Design a protein around this ligand. Structure first.
Ligand SMILES: [Zn+2]
Length: 230
């Protein structure tokens, strides 16, 4: 994979791996942790402000190339946040390993970049609730409500959603056909906290589908007390 010019590199691997050797100048960043609640405008603005602070502290600016060992959920959720803040982002899942030679962690000088939310990339709970085609990218067992993470009240799915397990997105050739989608189609994707759906988001977008990620996902949906099946 070719790289864009003057990119800032972001390594989404666990810190131990980063410390063992990263690309020269690469910053360490893994945004798998923050679970978001986005109902009020103030909450969306809070996210945008938080991204501005993050972008400035890490000296981020377009274009940003994020890399990890394979197409991981931590890589895509992190790339999703950076792109959502308005940065031009690219994923790099293989081929960077020969260059992971630097041990010292860079100390960038605060850039003055300011995040600008790309609302078009996102689905809030209200938008997800009214979406005509929501794909739940969790496992069939999660979809059926047989299991659920301990941080949530019970098992369930957003009513009317269709199950399209993450795994399917790893075989892009003929995917839109197996899913019955086509370029330009509006598709929403969600899961527990938007990580696996961020993966489906990027895959679908690369195939021309207008995918939007319900970042709050099932965790937020349940905290809000919205209807669920079964
Ligand atoms: Zn949860």
């Amino acid at each position: 994979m070719n790289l864009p010019e003057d990119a800032v590199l972001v390594d989404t691997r666990p810190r131990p791996a980063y410390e063992a050797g990263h690309l020269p100048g690469a910053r360490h960043l893994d945004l798998s942790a923050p679970k978001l609640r986005l109902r009020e405008e103030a909450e969306l603005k809070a996210l945008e402000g938080g991204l501005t602070e993050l972008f400035q502290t890490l000296g981020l600016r377009s274009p940003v190339v994020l890399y990890d060992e394979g197409l991981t959920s931590r890589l895509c959720r992190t790339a999703f946040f950076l792109g959502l803040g308005g940065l031009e982002v690219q994923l790099w899942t293989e081929g960077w390993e020969p260059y992971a030679t630097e041990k010292e962690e860079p100390k960038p000088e605060r850039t003055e970049v300011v995040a600008k939310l790309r609302r078009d990339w996102l689905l809030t709970a209200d938008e997800a609730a009214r979406h005509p085609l929501l794909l739940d990218v969790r496992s069939p067992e999660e979809f059926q409500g047989k299991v659920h993470p301990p941080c949530c009240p019970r098992g369930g799915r957003i009513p009317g959603s269709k199950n399209a397990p993450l795994e399917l997105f790893l075989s892009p050739e003929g995917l839109l056909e197996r899913l019955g989608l086509q370029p330009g189609q509006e598709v929403g994707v969600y899961c527990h906290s938007g990580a696996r759906s961020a993966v489906a988001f990027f895959v679908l977008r690369s195939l021309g589908v207008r995918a939007r990620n319900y970042l709050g996902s099932m965790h937020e949906w349940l905290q809000e007390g919205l209807p669920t099946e079964p």
